[PDB]
Amino acid sequence: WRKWNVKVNHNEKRYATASAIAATAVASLVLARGHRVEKIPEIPLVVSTDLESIQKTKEAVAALKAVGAHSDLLKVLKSKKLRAGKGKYRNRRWTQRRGPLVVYAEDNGIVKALRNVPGVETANVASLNLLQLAPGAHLGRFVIWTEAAFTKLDQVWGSETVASSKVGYTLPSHIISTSDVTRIINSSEIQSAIRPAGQATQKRTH
Amino acid sequence: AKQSLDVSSDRRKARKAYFTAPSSQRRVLLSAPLSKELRAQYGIKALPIRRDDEVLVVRGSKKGQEGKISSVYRLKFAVQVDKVTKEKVNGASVPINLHPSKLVITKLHLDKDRKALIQRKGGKLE
Amino acid sequence: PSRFTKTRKHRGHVSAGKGRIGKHRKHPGGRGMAGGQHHHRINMDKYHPGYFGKVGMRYFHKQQAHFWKPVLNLDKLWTLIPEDKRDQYLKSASKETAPVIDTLAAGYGKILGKGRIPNVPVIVKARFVSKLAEEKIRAAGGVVELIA
Amino acid sequence: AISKNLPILKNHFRKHWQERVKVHFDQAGKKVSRRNARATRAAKIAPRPLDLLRPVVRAPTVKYNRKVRAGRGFTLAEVKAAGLTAAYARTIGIAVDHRRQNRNQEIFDANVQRLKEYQSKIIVFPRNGKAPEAEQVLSAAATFPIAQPATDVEARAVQDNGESAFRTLRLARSEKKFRGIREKRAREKAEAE
RNA sequence: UUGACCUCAAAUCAGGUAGGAGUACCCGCUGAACUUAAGCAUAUCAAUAAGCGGAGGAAAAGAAACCAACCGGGAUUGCCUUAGUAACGGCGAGUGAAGCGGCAAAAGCUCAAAUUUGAAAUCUGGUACCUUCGGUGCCCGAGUUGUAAUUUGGAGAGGGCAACUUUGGGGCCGUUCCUUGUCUAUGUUCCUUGGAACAGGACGUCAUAGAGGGUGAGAAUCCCGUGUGGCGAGGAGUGCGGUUCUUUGUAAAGUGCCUUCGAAGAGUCGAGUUGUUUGGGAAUGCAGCUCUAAGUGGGUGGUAAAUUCCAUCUAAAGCUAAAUAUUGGCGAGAGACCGAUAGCGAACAAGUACAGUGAUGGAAAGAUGAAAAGAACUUUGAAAAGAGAGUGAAAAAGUACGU
RNA sequence: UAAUGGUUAUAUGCCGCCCGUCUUGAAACACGGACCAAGGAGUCUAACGUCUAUGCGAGUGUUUGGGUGUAAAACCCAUACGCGUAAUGAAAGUGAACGUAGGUUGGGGCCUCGCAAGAGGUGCACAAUCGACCGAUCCUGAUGUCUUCGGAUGGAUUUG
RNA sequence: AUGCCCUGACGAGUAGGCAGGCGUGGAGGUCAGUGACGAAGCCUAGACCGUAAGGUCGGGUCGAACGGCCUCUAGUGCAGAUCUUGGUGGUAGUAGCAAAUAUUCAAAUGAGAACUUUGAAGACUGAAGUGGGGAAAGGUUCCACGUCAACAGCAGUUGGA
Ligand SMILES: [Mg+2]
Ligand SMILES: [Mg+2]
Ligand SMILES: [Mg+2]
Ligand SMILES: [Mg+2]
Ligand SMILES: [Mg+2]
Ligand SMILES: [Mg+2]
Ligand SMILES: [Mg+2]
Ligand SMILES: [Mg+2]
Ligand SMILES: [Mg+2]
Ligand SMILES: [Mg+2]
Ligand SMILES: [Mg+2]
Ligand SMILES: [Mg+2]
Ligand SMILES: [Mg+2]
Ligand SMILES: [Mg+2]
Ligand SMILES: [Mg+2]
Ligand SMILES: [Mg+2]
Ligand SMILES: [Mg+2]
Ligand SMILES: [Mg+2]
Ligand SMILES: [Mg+2]
Ligand SMILES: [Mg+2]
Ligand SMILES: [Mg+2]
Ligand SMILES: [Mg+2]
Ligand SMILES: [Mg+2]
Ligand SMILES: [Mg+2]
Ligand SMILES: [Mg+2]
Ligand SMILES: [Mg+2]
Ligand SMILES: [Mg+2]
Ligand SMILES: [Mg+2]
Ligand SMILES: [Mg+2]
Ligand SMILES: [Mg+2]
Ligand SMILES: [Mg+2]
Ligand SMILES: [Mg+2]
Ligand SMILES: [Mg+2]
Ligand SMILES: [Mg+2]
Ligand SMILES: [Mg+2]
Ligand SMILES: [Mg+2]
Ligand SMILES: [Mg+2]
Ligand SMILES: [Mg+2]
Ligand SMILES: [Mg+2]
Ligand SMILES: [Mg+2]
Ligand SMILES: [Mg+2]
Ligand SMILES: [Mg+2]
Ligand SMILES: [Mg+2]
Ligand SMILES: [Mg+2]
Ligand SMILES: [Mg+2]
Ligand SMILES: [Mg+2]
Ligand SMILES: [Mg+2]
Ligand SMILES: [Mg+2]
Ligand SMILES: [Mg+2]
Ligand SMILES: [Mg+2]
Ligand SMILES: [Mg+2]
Ligand SMILES: [Mg+2]
Ligand SMILES: [Mg+2]
Ligand SMILES: [Mg+2]
Ligand SMILES: [Mg+2]
Ligand SMILES: [Mg+2]
Ligand SMILES: [Mg+2]
Ligand SMILES: [Mg+2]
Ligand SMILES: [Mg+2]
Ligand SMILES: [Mg+2]
Ligand SMILES: [Mg+2]
Ligand SMILES: [Mg+2]
Ligand SMILES: [Mg+2]
Ligand SMILES: [Mg+2]
Ligand SMILES: [Mg+2]
Ligand SMILES: [Mg+2]
Ligand SMILES: [Mg+2]
Ligand SMILES: [Mg+2]
Ligand SMILES: [Mg+2]
Ligand SMILES: [Mg+2]
Ligand SMILES: [Mg+2]
Ligand SMILES: [Mg+2]
Ligand SMILES: [Mg+2]
Ligand SMILES: [Mg+2]
Ligand SMILES: [Mg+2]
Ligand SMILES: [Mg+2]
Ligand SMILES: [Mg+2]
Ligand SMILES: [Mg+2]
Ligand SMILES: [Mg+2]
Ligand SMILES: [Mg+2]
Ligand SMILES: [Mg+2]
Ligand SMILES: [Mg+2]
Ligand SMILES: [Mg+2]
Ligand SMILES: [Mg+2]
Ligand SMILES: [Mg+2]
Ligand SMILES: [Mg+2]
Ligand SMILES: [Mg+2]
Ligand SMILES: [Mg+2]
Ligand SMILES: [Mg+2]
Ligand SMILES: [Mg+2]
Ligand SMILES: [Mg+2]
Ligand SMILES: [Mg+2]
Ligand SMILES: [Mg+2]
Ligand SMILES: [Mg+2]
Ligand SMILES: [Mg+2]
Ligand SMILES: [Mg+2]
Ligand SMILES: [Mg+2]
Ligand SMILES: [Mg+2]
Ligand SMILES: [Mg+2]
Ligand SMILES: [Mg+2]
Ligand SMILES: [Mg+2]
Ligand SMILES: [Mg+2]
Ligand SMILES: [Mg+2]
Ligand SMILES: [Mg+2]
Ligand SMILES: [Mg+2]
Ligand SMILES: [Mg+2]
Ligand SMILES: [Mg+2]
Ligand SMILES: [Mg+2]
């Protein structure tokens, strides 16, 4: 009768999920989290909806290597290690890195085709597990979207013109309008209003 | 990945099921692959191993040696192949235990049950 | 969060934060509410005044649905009209078409007069109202309808 | 002991309560098995819809008499007014309650209408014939839903006669409070001379 | 004399049944104390532990002598809540429900009961033949001190008449399911290290299979499996595609009026007293003793009583699946569990060795090596053994063996 | 480069009583401690106070259940229910704006004039105080009454 | 930019509070981390860093796994408890092995004889026996052959081993 599960507020779960989805955008978080995406042209990586109908593992890995997940797919299966400790004989014998998350809107073979590929996890846009999106509570999973998945995301989480399709839900507000304060500080309205600055290391008088 | 709730990924259970297997289960467990010639001839890849089979060792320190399997020692999970011996210092000759997965069958002992086994696995029997 | 506890910080220090003199024991003042009239009397009167003794008359077999009468105040009272209709009902206020608010259908049993409905006529259906609720509802030009 | 300004607690753990601790670790497993039982039962009672038709009844207890809900069964009188018998209605998916009675014409008409809608929307298969399959819908409750009856329109004319309607509650409370003592006063006036 | 009847016996008479084990959960009886109250006696622990009786895969409960007071719900059970509340309590410590509402599951019924009275229409047994969990015939028996048919309060029965609707069973293969067998992919290619490649590097292949485990060191690809499907085999009171007993048959069951009825459980309900129990308070339930009902009346409607009503059920007889429980048994699958002073007492010939008269108590004890390859042979010594030699990657692994 | 320095052993000078514990007071002629290894003691739960953090906010709480699932995860969800939005009284009950939701005294910040100092204005939070309103208590007792009900209005060193 | 810099003051502490850190088992993530060309462990009056908790390296031994950082979690840190279990000391080659009168010579056996066997001598129990049998209890101890690692508190070639 120890507490094993922990209740989280549903709206705070949705907050964390939405911030995880937003962190699967710009590539600094994806590089800092792991995820060899330095030779990827643009994040989000959205591929065509024909991926969801691929039902061979060989064709699926050809598609992932062709759209650019080759070095991440090689980071997994070269990171397979025997687990340090007593966990290795508690059915937790090998550890490996996380591969890409392939996120789809409808499943026509892609789940089973990418099932056997190490590191690679698949997901429906209807769900989007936070355990998959920010594993180890590190933001910025490498995510390959299909076009249908990317379109359906606007209906699953809402916008300024689509509500949310979750009951009562709105995406969270911002308490600050920009995330980089240096251009607010070097804006002309603050700079013309502030006094001149000093030496930035004071002279040692006396 | 496992898909059925009947088989076990438990390492302890798998090792008890290996080390406490009866001999009729150890016969299947002590399988041995065929050679390139026999795999082309019989269309199948591996068979349970027999006494009068001719084998080539392809691993370990006696690799590349030939012989007939003198004994299938299922209690030790081993096969004893003649011409593959250890000369002791008193002049005695003891058989070296080999595992059949490190062997390659180069000639089968065929009888009616082996022929039916090959045909059951889909073999050409040629 | 076992690693954040002060048990982890009292490791090495003899008494685990409990003192060498007073010397942490099993139950030094009794168990539970023991001695609330003898040695815990000051913690009773000072912080639980009224704790001991009887108060008025008993009710055998009380059902707390003879007493369900949730109270609505007039300061809200237009929340019960949905927001798309609220604007059109308070703009160009009208008798001969006034909103009907069933208060029971929203789950209150009494209307009370906290303050200042606007001057729009309203038909308020209530199980119970107070006098000042009646006075302010009629001063807006409306009516209270008694329902059961 | 008793110490600083804290609420006085009433935790009842002076029995051997640890012999009787049930932790529901099997919540997900019992959900899987309830869904398995629903699927198995559905396959066993193919095309029949896995639950009986229940009537709409008014909930008791003046806290809850503003709501209607699903009751247990239809009322022999309701079954007869719908045009069938109880022993045959129990075989075509209608729950029948012999022990409830109708004293509300609106509830009665709602349940006779509910029964006639059901009898129009079911296909009773022939008893010995070929009986072509009619695509199992798994729930009668989600296809004949319990609707809260509309009691008023959104807007009407203000009809204020100046009765003042707090005075109505005060006077009606006073007549109940003094009905017996002044009925007895009236009869002792009648016992004069 | 003889023939019954009733009651009681006997038999190694014919056939059958009970005991004991297990006992986690279940239905009962019985029943403490430590403890808390900062002492203690009521109280609390606790309607618990121990003790005893009885079941099953669930049990129990269960189709209202219910809840209510509403515009009323509607068998039982369980969860969420009601609620640490109403209430009880040296009104102290403490204790403590229920109705409503939302869900899970849902299922309803059977006797006493009536004159069959122009059919004891009913049933056990034996015997004979079969379609052998049974049927049919015959005979003896049970039984009128009442076995069948009809009826169960929601009703219903008798009679009188416009009237239409519905006929039940038995064997085969696949199929619901259970048990179980079998088949089903891809490198053992090169070089380096090593005793051993399963390591490292290079070139590939399969992947609805990169779970897991073995194999001389981290093996998807060597082996078993895994994944996906196919082919069987042996069984389970059948949802259906065919089969057939076809004067199964003025059967049986429903449904409309009218009329006369409408039987409904006794030392029981209830009452007093005593004791126990309960949150149940001028008595919540149970039990002992005493008193002992009625039939538009009996119970209940949470403050005792008289009077007047009202509301709600219909006890003193009985059956019933599910949702619920389950430190036992069988079979599985898992784990942010423990890792040989831990985890069960027990990883091992562990409830063992051993102690006690006995009830009972109750340990310690895993690891050579990849393979015994477990040290041929020489020499010293009476021998143990030593020194060499030798095996082994290692003897800084030599059975007194990983480190 | 051990030449200076570090480490270590030793010598020398001065200093240095045995730790833990209870205690006013321990080196104590107080108690435990021969030694070493391994084990070994504020935990988990129900309810709750303060504070803090997060989400939403007059609301909030998805996880009892239902749907769904790559399956004890994750995702989605209705009706309820709990707590909050109303108090007070033993209870029957009643139930919160005279006013710009009041006056006064302070009051950050802001506004006006000022080169400042200041002067004025507005003053949220909060503190003090006097009032107003709601309930309980004690009074007063209007219009009506099918005459004993009702309880308007006005009060109070009372009380929440 | 819980960064860097400037200026000033301050620093005792039981019981206790709070903070910032060090370390251990396990979990999620990462370093495509280390490793049979040697992981972990262990030893090391060798070295380096940290005020310290500790961390790092070199050498020896060893043979299969294990680390850093970011988080999560706890059966998480020992000198004590007449603590528990196991092991080992000093005392210490010490106290002791002194009741029941008592042994001795030869030969044989044997590697080895105070103690075995046989001969010889000397003694004792002294028929309410240190004799001959049984009851309870024990359970093969009886007897023969082989044999001495342990046991017979010296020895042993002997033995109820
Ligand atoms: Mg939420
Ligand atoms: Mg493929
Ligand atoms: Mg590894
Ligand atoms: Mg790991
Ligand atoms: Mg581990
Ligand atoms: Mg380990
Ligand atoms: Mg380790
Ligand atoms: Mg395990
Ligand atoms: Mg495993
Ligand atoms: Mg494993
Ligand atoms: Mg926010
Ligand atoms: Mg064969
Ligand atoms: Mg913290
Ligand atoms: Mg200390
Ligand atoms: Mg410390
Ligand atoms: Mg201290
Ligand atoms: Mg403290
Ligand atoms: Mg102490
Ligand atoms: Mg104290
Ligand atoms: Mg204390
Ligand atoms: Mg006193
Ligand atoms: Mg009290
Ligand atoms: Mg009182
Ligand atoms: Mg009272
Ligand atoms: Mg009022
Ligand atoms: Mg205090
Ligand atoms: Mg689920
Ligand atoms: Mg289950
Ligand atoms: Mg169902
Ligand atoms: Mg009604
Ligand atoms: Mg007999
Ligand atoms: Mg028995
Ligand atoms: Mg039990
Ligand atoms: Mg019971
Ligand atoms: Mg106790
Ligand atoms: Mg107590
Ligand atoms: Mg006491
Ligand atoms: Mg005490
Ligand atoms: Mg006391
Ligand atoms: Mg005492
Ligand atoms: Mg009790
Ligand atoms: Mg108990
Ligand atoms: Mg018991
Ligand atoms: Mg007893
Ligand atoms: Mg049984
Ligand atoms: Mg069941
Ligand atoms: Mg039963
Ligand atoms: Mg029963
Ligand atoms: Mg009844
Ligand atoms: Mg009710
Ligand atoms: Mg009723
Ligand atoms: Mg009920
Ligand atoms: Mg419950
Ligand atoms: Mg509730
Ligand atoms: Mg509550
Ligand atoms: Mg009790
Ligand atoms: Mg309910
Ligand atoms: Mg009945
Ligand atoms: Mg090789
Ligand atoms: Mg290697
Ligand atoms: Mg090279
Ligand atoms: Mg091998
Ligand atoms: Mg392997
Ligand atoms: Mg595989
Ligand atoms: Mg595999
Ligand atoms: Mg499979
Ligand atoms: Mg009939
Ligand atoms: Mg009756
Ligand atoms: Mg009687
Ligand atoms: Mg009686
Ligand atoms: Mg009793
Ligand atoms: Mg009691
Ligand atoms: Mg009583
Ligand atoms: Mg009594
Ligand atoms: Mg009463
Ligand atoms: Mg685990
Ligand atoms: Mg160990
Ligand atoms: Mg053990
Ligand atoms: Mg043990
Ligand atoms: Mg054992
Ligand atoms: Mg004894
Ligand atoms: Mg004994
Ligand atoms: Mg060892
Ligand atoms: Mg090896
Ligand atoms: Mg030597
Ligand atoms: Mg060698
Ligand atoms: Mg070695
Ligand atoms: Mg060597
Ligand atoms: Mg050697
Ligand atoms: Mg070694
Ligand atoms: Mg020099
Ligand atoms: Mg030098
Ligand atoms: Mg010196
Ligand atoms: Mg000196
Ligand atoms: Mg000195
Ligand atoms: Mg000196
Ligand atoms: Mg001097
Ligand atoms: Mg000195
Ligand atoms: Mg002490
Ligand atoms: Mg003293
Ligand atoms: Mg002194
Ligand atoms: Mg001291
Ligand atoms: Mg002294
Ligand atoms: Mg002393
Ligand atoms: Mg002492
Ligand atoms: Mg010491
Ligand atoms: Mg001592
Ligand atoms: Mg230790």
Ligand SMILES: [Mg+2]
């Ligand atoms: Mg330790």
Ligand SMILES: [Mg+2]
């Ligand atoms: Mg301890």
Ligand SMILES: [Mg+2]
């Ligand atoms: Mg909720």
Ligand SMILES: [Mg+2]
């Ligand atoms: Mg969710």
Ligand SMILES: [Mg+2]
């Ligand atoms: Mg009230």
Ligand SMILES: [Mg+2]
């Ligand atoms: Mg009053």
Ligand SMILES: [Mg+2]
């Ligand atoms: Mg005002």
Ligand SMILES: [Mg+2]
């Ligand atoms: Mg006023």
Ligand SMILES: [Mg+2]
């Ligand atoms: Mg102010």
Ligand SMILES: [Mg+2]
């Ligand atoms: Mg007032």
Ligand SMILES: [Mg+2]
């Ligand atoms: Mg008030």
Ligand SMILES: [Mg+2]
């Ligand atoms: Mg007042």
Ligand SMILES: [Mg+2]
């Ligand atoms: Mg100073």
Ligand SMILES: [Mg+2]
């Ligand atoms: Mg200091």
Ligand SMILES: [Mg+2]
């Ligand atoms: Mg520090």
Ligand SMILES: [Mg+2]
């Ligand atoms: Mg642990």
